Amino acid sequence: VDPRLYFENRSKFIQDQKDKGINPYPHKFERTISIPEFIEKYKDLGNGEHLEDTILNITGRIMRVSASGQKLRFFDLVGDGEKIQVLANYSFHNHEKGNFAECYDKIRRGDIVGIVGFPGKSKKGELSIFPKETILLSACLHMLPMKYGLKDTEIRYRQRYLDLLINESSRHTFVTRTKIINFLRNFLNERGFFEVETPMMNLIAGGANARPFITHHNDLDLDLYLRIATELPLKMLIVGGIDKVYEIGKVFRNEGIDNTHNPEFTSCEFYWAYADYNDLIKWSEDFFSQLVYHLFGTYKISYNKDGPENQPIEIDFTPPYPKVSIVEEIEKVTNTILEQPFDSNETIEKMINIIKEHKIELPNPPTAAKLLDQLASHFIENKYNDKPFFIVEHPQIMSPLAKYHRTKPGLTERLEMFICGKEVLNAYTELNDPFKQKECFKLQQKDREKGDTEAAQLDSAFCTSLEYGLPPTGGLGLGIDRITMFLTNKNSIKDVILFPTMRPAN
Amino acid sequence: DPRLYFENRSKFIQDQKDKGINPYPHKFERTISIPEFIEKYKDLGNGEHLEDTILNITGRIMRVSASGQKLRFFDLVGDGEKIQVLANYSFHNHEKGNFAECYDKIRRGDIVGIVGFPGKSKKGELSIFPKETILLSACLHMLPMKYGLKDTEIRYRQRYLDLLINESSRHTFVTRTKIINFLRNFLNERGFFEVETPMMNLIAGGANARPFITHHNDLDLDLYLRIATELPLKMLIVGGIDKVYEIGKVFRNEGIDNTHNPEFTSCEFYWAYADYNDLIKWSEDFFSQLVYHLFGTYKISYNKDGPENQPIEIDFTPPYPKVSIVEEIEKVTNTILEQPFDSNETIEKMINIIKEHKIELPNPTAAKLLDQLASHFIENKYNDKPFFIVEHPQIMSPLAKYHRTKPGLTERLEMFICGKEVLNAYTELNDPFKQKECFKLQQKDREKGDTEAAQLDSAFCTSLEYGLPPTGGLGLGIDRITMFLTNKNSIKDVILFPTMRPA
């Protein structure tokens, strides 16, 4: 009933041990077997069968406490996601080491224990460790929460260690997460790609449309920005001759937090010399179809799109995926023509009016790209939940770094894969002409002058590298935390990050 | 003069745009790479042409030469390998353009798309014989030669130029990536689990270092970049992930030199039920197996005093020497450092030792004092082999478990190559009551003006109360390890883009 008193009592227990000799936090307990190795080694065992001649050293944490009297104690020992029962029988206690009840009366739920004992099955067939001696390695001073206590509470986030022990689903989630990354690292390695590291602190934060973080180095007396993307120095490396290059790492964007946006998230971006939009389309279908089959043995997975209570939709990752041109589909759904230039007063007022007619949010500032972006967000982004699908060939006012379309004026060779209306992949044929790049950086600075503080600044060091000749390349970005959300059936980005960014408890 | 060169090539590109031809074509389908090309056709004798194999080649032209008007030669470099291109007036497809006009425009550094056949020259240099050559992306500047990158900062700002000219820089970052590749699989074979902890936190803990500050606007919240991955990894051990690690960047806001870049790559792992001794063997196993994986031997050549002096042989054969820090300082300085080490007297004693040896007084707490004594009297004891500094005082190690038999010390180890700290490990402190004792001690030395004194994480202290099992944790400095395995005397030579001033 009273956790504050429970913790105050256990604190006295630890100090009462030190006064009366014992050390409650010993340095080393040489373990002999792990609990998973234990279950494998002795699961194929008969009912009631003991092997009291094989003595083993095993560790773990107590998570269930019960007793069938003063002479038989029952526990649940967990370790590495698995579990065995501890069957402490008074007959098998090494009495030279201490009194049976005095030893086990101290055990509480959460205690980390070292056990010397032998393996066997119970009468009912429960595979158990049968201790000869049990020594406390690291006591748990607090009361562990119940599964109910964490269900719709933020303790999973602020106290992830509780979530990792109590909920089996949590360990499963993050084991899947690093399997997603393990797949992608080798998927690129087996294809001749070269993993690198580009700085996260920069004089200018380019590569995306987002407000950055700013820090300060004292000894240099220099203001550095946290990277919002890895796009530019990776393209500088293609110039350097590394024709197959990529990076898996954290990027930082100082903007709103919600179920799809954590301030720091993991991205992967690879750059592929002598590849284009089509290769990036085929790559995205190849990788996602194989990523999903690698984890599930199927191409169709089910996802609770509307939360856990409501029924799930089924997502079919089987290639090929639908391709939807952003301008012409917005055209069709709205029955209008977006005349070019898309950034003209006529086309901007037009889009303002169709945003106003449908009572959709007006973006501030009403830049032409944000109008198009909200139009695409409100009209084409949730077109398919049955499968992933590509929104392609964005106008050049939206894609300052994408190469212009080879047969469609004003558009780019850009693609974007969505799952359940959530952007998960960004790719395009790279804009490799320094003459046309400055015009998209100087037009972005004027967009910056209108209050669009996401409008990309002028990186000069990157512009100079374009002047030594960037070969025709194709680059693609992956939002890893979002891929993990869908592939682990979680509705929040806080559920696929170990320690998400939270409002402080003060 | 370069300025005129860039402007001619700049005007040259605009001429092509007005003249009709696209100077930056969208797509050239390559059939074969330059590495595959050498592998596929290395064995051809001097003079043979397979005129039937019409191939599509890519690369960067890095040499221009001619023999009259009908013969043109270039060096096509790609993926670190180089082949010849022999353009001859007979094989040229005259339907696509004039021979001389097509090839007079190609200059050193240009990205081209060649369609031709494989063959070896009369002198026997493996060549590609184009029927048609297309400029895919032009080099507008003048690329320097190898000497243009010697006495300059250019390698660090324009790493792409260094990678394109100095063939050794490409070897170093391949080695850097192979180092990390080996370490990840070394841990993964032993059941370790890779995670990613926050880089922005309410508190910067896990090391004795001053952090960077930043601000998240929507939350109106100041956040510190992580100086270590230590504390959030240990709370994951509490969560039941007994073999956890993270290979990533950490940020420390201090001075820059040849072994300090404000952001650097570390690897920390945490191994429950292991100890000071298990980590000692892990370090010896890993560094011996890593060296052998790279070099086929346990002995390395490293120019400790630069390429202008004779190098030394680093023998990574295990085991490595272990040296106690307080014991050795006391022997080498012929003094007695008494406990408490942060007592006024032995603080005054260490200060006087530094004074009569004429060493610089650290901005003078006992832990900073001890660190200075170790740096000048211990840390260069062994250069021919890596060695461990062990059993540090707890005054220095607030997160390390106290030594089980040596009072005042901890079960800590630091490994050094050529006097550079490259590894840090100890038996983790898991008694939460001793932890807050050590964190409150850091605040007293923080009150004396220590920017690098650890502030207490209340989240982390609460974590140990739920029970942190006996654990041994270790930390690697990836960049510094990369330096010694690539024979580099600066950390900037192993970081693709080191932190530097604006141009």
Ligand SMILES: O=C1O[C@@H](CC2CCCCC2)Cc2cc(O)cc(O)c21
């Ligand atoms: O995860 C995210 O996805 C990216 C979008 C992602 C699409 C694929 C290419 C890389 C970028 C956008 C974003 C913003 C933010 O402030 C926080 C976040 O977690 C994310």
Ligand SMILES: O=C1O[C@@H](CC2CCCCC2)Cc2cc(O)cc(O)c21
């Ligand atoms: O390279 C470095 O190594 C680490 C020391 C290294 C020892 C082994 C464990 C990981 C940390 C110290 C350091 C500080 C700094 O501000 C910039 C830097 O580049 C380095």
Ligand SMILES: N[C@@H](CCCC[NH3+])C(=O)O
């Ligand atoms: N850096 C991009 C991803 C790669 C786009 C294609 N080069 C982004 O932030 O979305």
Ligand SMILES: N[C@@H](CCCC[NH3+])C(=O)O
């Ligand atoms: N975080 C430590 C490395 C790990 C030490 C053992 N937990 C450091 O910065 O040196």
